[PDB]
Amino acid sequence: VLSEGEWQLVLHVWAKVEADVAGHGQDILIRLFKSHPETLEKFDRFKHLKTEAEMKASEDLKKHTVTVLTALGAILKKKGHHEAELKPLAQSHATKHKIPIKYLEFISEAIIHVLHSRHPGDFGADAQGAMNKALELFRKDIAAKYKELGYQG
């Protein structure tokens, strides 16, 4: 369970993401695909993309990243009270997309990397610790739902 102080550190950096969610989204998914290329294979819609330049140029990818970060932002804003938000997300990611917990760890790494790079003013050590805790909570709660849904993860 995160403290209110920890949630405020999470939300204060998220406020900066929201200046330009699309640009942050592109950076995060591209970082994921670069660091862990196997993750790209889960996206039938995007797996044809060969290079960072192609990824950056894809309007379709950009739009998807906005969807992803907006969904995550809505979860974070619930400050742990995210049961309603996690239900549809866990179901689609377990049963339609088949995304293991390991891959959610990878995207968490990418989020932390991009925030660390872009936002040193709001992503010092304590703030990064808080974001790590928030993403760990998200992954733990998704993992529990995965199990309930019949997916090993």
Query: Interface residues with ligand HEM (CB under 6 A)?
Result: 39, 42-45, 67-68, 71-72, 89, 92-93, 97, 99, 103-104, 107
Reduced DSSP (H G I as helix, E B as strand, rest coil) percent helix, strand, coil of the chain, to 5: 75, 0, 25
Cβ proximity to ligand HEM: between 12 and 42 the closer is 42
- Give helix 59-77 / helix 83-91 axis angle, nearest 10°: 140
Cβ proximity to ligand HEM: between 71 and 121 the closer is 71
Q: Which two tokens stand for residue 85?
A: 């938000």
Q: Reduced to 3 states, what is the DSSP secondary structure of residue 77?
A: helix
Q: How far is the CB of 75 from ligand HEM (least distance, A)?
A: 7
24 is in an annotated binding site: no
Q: How far is the CB of 127 from ligand HEM (least distance, A)?
A: 18
Q: How far is the CB of 142 from ligand HEM (least distance, A)?
A: 8
| Nearby residues of 80 by Cβ (< 8 Å), 6 or more positions away | 1, 2, 7, 137
Using only the alpha carbons of the chain, give its radius of gyration: 15
Q: How far is the CB of 125 from ligand HEM (least distance, A)?
A: 22
As annotated, the binding site for O2 includes: 64
Residue list, annotated binding site for nitrite = 64
Residue list, annotated binding site: 64, 93
